[PDB]
Design a protein around this nucleic acid. Structure first.
Lengths: 341, 107, 52
RNA sequence: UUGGCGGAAAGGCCUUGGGUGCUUGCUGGCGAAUUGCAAUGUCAUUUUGCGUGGGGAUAAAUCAUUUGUAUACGACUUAGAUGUACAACGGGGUAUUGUAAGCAGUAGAGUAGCCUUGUUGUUACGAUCUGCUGAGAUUAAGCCUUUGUUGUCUGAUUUGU
RNA sequence: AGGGAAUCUGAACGAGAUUCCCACUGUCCCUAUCUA
RNA sequence: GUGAACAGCCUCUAGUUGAUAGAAUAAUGUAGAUAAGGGAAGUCGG
């Protein structure tokens, strides 16, 4: 096999942490560098191909895309790291004073038995003109060469029966560390949307813990699957919206439909919020939390520069076989049934 | 509290992916486990008529949904499960498919 | 065939990266940060919904 | 006690002052002995426990049940002390199969049978075709959704700077 | 009421042997899944 | 008894329910299946 992907062992957690970040330019505006959601879905798209030099210039191509569900990420903190001869070293983290039920749930393994007394003295530590919070924020701005944002996911807006959101750390590639820590100050308790991180025609690297297959039998026997994998260069085809109906509508199809198939995806619900439709196949299975970083570097070929003109979204039944896009088209083709009249 | 209800149990769900030689004895164990879930007592006693109902189609062909009459009572002196027992009986219906869990009126 | 780490191809790709190839990414970044700045104002309006 | 400074392990560095002892800068007056001719002659700094006399602070984890993104067993991810809670049923969708049981018919080969000897004459048997009927059944067990009905919410242990 | 045709061996043979022609197959390309 | 049948499959008379159990159900192993396209290219040798 590949000797790089060793030791071929089970990961530390389902939420794999992002190993490296995109560099930094100290003149660029403040913007997030990685996003997270919940991968669950896969679907077929057709599009006309404006890729000149190819055998399919001004032709149409069918291809497989994946739908990661991405509820609006909520900022609950910021971390500052000093540059040492020993690597980086977190000197101060700061939180949001009033955090959701989801994250106070993340701080316990057994949620129901506890008195739910998580950040009581920390919120009481805030309870004045600030004084100590602004002291720690001065501490971050004075030192700390890089600044990373503590976020979490909106787990309840996702159909998952987990209730327990994931903490993460996302660096900022907007220059002047002052603007980093003050962007964070403008964003405590607030939420960050998907399309404020990504857009169409943008290459990303989705990282995921790879679908556990359990025990398996130099070509050696042992563990197969459940490894933390980084896959790079998956083009974003569509960023979606929850409130907006006709997400499944293209420039061509234009029928008022959601990208959610009939009876939803298999083993996972519908979509009730923002999503990213990424091309190809992201690692992990359905219901799996994926962390989407962006490219690391200027990765422009013509596979990264071209504009996607989506023509049609397959929303037919994945559970079973596909014959109808809408429920409306099933009973339009069928005629009327027994229990109808 | 001595209370009697009725229940439809999806034996197609619980006996899914179980070997043909061991469905009917497991169906006994699944009805006992189901009654322990709903009554909160250990001693689940079963009607001999219910046993006749399970084992009707041999061992390999236990039905998909059976409608039962699980009944909480009070257990007598010299008891280890202190001091209540469930008692499960079958009820007569042409099809058990599509019935609500309903509290039985005792007279 | 020239390798992935073939020096001449890395230099030819650096000739690319100082032209159109970075400029499109540096326009996309401005459009992303713009909508991020737009995301503050909406939430501030929903601050003023409760403040009303 | 006023600040300023210190992130490389900062855990310390300078500074503003009030009090407060002491000063061998110089000069006086007392006291030391018997540890008997030496015997480290114990004056340092950790980690504590029991006592005191003052401040301060009002948990989780494991087992057991469940979950299935995990799974040889471990381990992992979940869920659960009154809730857009959970469990069981129930309904709605989506799929798979291909027209369920029962009943009726003028569609009926071929026949039994009343004689008006038939030019869909008749009473009955009568493969199958047809209709109620894309019906019936199954549909989560590792699909989706849940204004329905019914019920559960508390057991044992372990942990201290 | 599995073939067929030759040849080596003791004209058909005999589950004799070999070669070829036609058909067939997871033996393989290249494994995949299910049950016991 | 059905069946052309000493094929099985089902039973009457009579006699058994004896062989450690329970909980799980991943890979491997043995055995049996099915499989796109090609049809011995496998192998010393269908």
């Amino acid at each position: 096999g590949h000797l790089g992907f060793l030791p071929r062992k089970r990961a530390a957690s389902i939420r794999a942490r992002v190993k490296a970040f995109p560099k930094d330019d100290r003149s660029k505006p403040v913007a997030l560098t990685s996003f997270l959601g919940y991968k669950a879905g896969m679907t077929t798209i057709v599009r006309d191909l404006d890729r000149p030099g190819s055998k399919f210039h001004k032709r149409e191509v069918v291809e497989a895309v994946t739908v990661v569900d991405t509820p609006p990420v909520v900022v609950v903190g910021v971390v500052g790291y000093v540059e040492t001869p020993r690597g980086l070293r977190s000197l101060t983290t700061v939180w949001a004073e009033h955090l959701s039920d989801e994250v106070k749930r993340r701080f316990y393994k057994n949620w129901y038995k506890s008195k739910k007394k998580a950040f009581t003295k920390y919120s009481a530590k805030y309870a004045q003109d600030g004084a100590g919070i602004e002291r720690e924020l001065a501490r971050i701005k004075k030192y700390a060469s890089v600044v990373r944002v503590l976020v979490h996911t909106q787990i309840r807006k996702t159909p998952l029966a987990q209730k327990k959101a994931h903490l993460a750390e996302i660096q900022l590639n907007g220059g002047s560390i002052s603007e980093k820590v003050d962007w964070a100050r403008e964003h405590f308790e607030k939420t960050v949307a998907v399309d404020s991180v990504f857009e169409q025609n943008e290459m990303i690297d989705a990282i995921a813990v790879t679908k556990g297959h359990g025990f398996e039998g130099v070509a050696r026997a042992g563990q197969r699957g459940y490894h933390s994998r980084t896959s790079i260069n998956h083009k974003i085809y569509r960023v979606g919206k929850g409130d907006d109906e006709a997400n499944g509508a293209t420039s061509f199809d234009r029928t008022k439909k959601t990208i959610t198939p009939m009876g939803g995806f298999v083993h996972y619900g519908e979509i009730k919020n923002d999503f990213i439709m990424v091309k190809g196949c992201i690692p992990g299975n359905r219901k799996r939390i994926v962390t989407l970083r962006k490219s690391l570097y200027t990765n422009t070929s013509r596979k990264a520069l071209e504009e996607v003109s989506l023509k049609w979204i397959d929303t037919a039944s994945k559970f079973g076989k596909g014959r109808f896009q809408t429920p409306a088209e099933k009973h339009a083709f069928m005629g009327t049934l027994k229990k109808d009249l | 509290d001595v209370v009697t209800r009725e229940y439809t149990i999806n034996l197609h769900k619980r006996l899914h992916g179980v070997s043909f030689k061991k469905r009917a004895p497991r169906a006994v164990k699944e009805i006992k486990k189901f009654a322990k879930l709903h009554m909160g007592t250990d001693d689940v006693r079963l009607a001999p008529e219910l046993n006749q109902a399970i084992w009707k189609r041999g061992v390999k062909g236990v039905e998909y949904r059976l409608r039962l009459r699980i009944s909480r009572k009070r257990n007598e002196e010299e008891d280890a499960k202190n001091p209540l027992f469930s008692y499960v009986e079958p009820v007569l219906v042409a099809s058990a498919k599509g019935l609500q869990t309903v509290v039985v009126e005792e007279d | 065939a020239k390798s992935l780490r073939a020096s001449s191809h890395l230099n030819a790709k650096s000739v690319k990266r100082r032209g159109v190839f970075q400029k499109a990414v540096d326009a996309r970044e401005q459009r992303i940060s713009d909508k991020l700045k737009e995301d503050l104002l909406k939430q501030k309006l929903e601050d003023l919904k409760k403040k009303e």
